[PDB]
Amino acid sequence: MEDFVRQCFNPMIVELAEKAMKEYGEDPKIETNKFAAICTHLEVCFMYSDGGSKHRFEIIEGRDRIMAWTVVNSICNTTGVEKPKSLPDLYDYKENRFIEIGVTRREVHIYYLEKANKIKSEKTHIHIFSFTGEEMATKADYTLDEESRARIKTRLFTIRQEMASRSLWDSFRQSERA
Ligand SMILES: [Mn+2]
Ligand SMILES: [Mn+2]
């Protein structure tokens, strides 16, 4: 699983994931499923930001915390948008909203509810992907064109396929907590 992560995700993604774990005192060589899941989430965030026209999205996820909030608070000042209680993943300059992205090993509906709740913000839009082609967005507004979504869903499906080929999928699949 460690090896699969290091083989399947760009080294920038792996470095950020390693860092995010060690900031919580977790060792990526031991909590290897969390390692994969962080990497997957970052990957989808980055894919998603490429999905628009360029300049459509600002990436917030993946930044150190000071930079992330610097971006967030700059956008709130510029655009007048309500400042979130916790860091989201992207800002959409076309729809003028923050977006919270989730990638679930469970079911999109439950994950969406947990997110809606974990953040509970009237403002932030939420878009959840599963590894089996499901997707659940705020007000069924899916933000990107269907081709862009399909590339994301295809990447997640390929990851899941590649893990199951190494017998990693069962354990990974079962590792997400409510
Ligand atoms: Mn985030
Ligand atoms: Mn997220």
Domain boundaries, the chain: 1-178
Experimental technique used to determine this entry: X-ray
Give me the residue label for tokens 């997400």.
176
Active site residue 115: yes
Residue 47 CB contacts under 8 Å (≥ 6 apart), including other chains: 151, 152, 155
Question: Residue 23, annotated ligand binder?
Answer: no
Question: Residue 41, annotated ligand binder?
Answer: yes
For 1-178, CATH number out of 3.40.30.10, 3.20.20.140, 3.40.640.10, 3.40.91.90 equals 3.40.91.90
Closest C-alpha among 76, 93, 94 to residue 85: 76
**141, 125 Cβ separation under 8 angstroms:** yes
CA-CA-CA-CA torsion sign (135, 137, 139, 145) = negative
Question: Residue 100, annotated ligand binder?
Answer: yes
**146 CA → ligand 1 middle, Å:** 23
Counting ligands in written order, which one lies closest to the CA of residue 86? 1
Residue 119 CB contacts under 8 Å (≥ 6 apart), including other chains: 84, 85, 86, 88, 100, 126
3-state class of 124 per DSSP? coil
**28, 2 Cβ separation under 8 angstroms:** yes
Check 83, 94, 115, 153 and give the catalytic one: 115
Question: Residue 30, annotated ligand binder?
Answer: no
Q: Give the other-Cβ count within 10 Å of 158's Cβ.
A: 12
**7 CA → ligand 1 middle, Å:** 23
Expressed in Å, this structure's resolution amounts to 2.2
**45 CA → ligand 2 middle, Å:** 8
Please name the residue ranges forming H helices in 85-145: 108-119
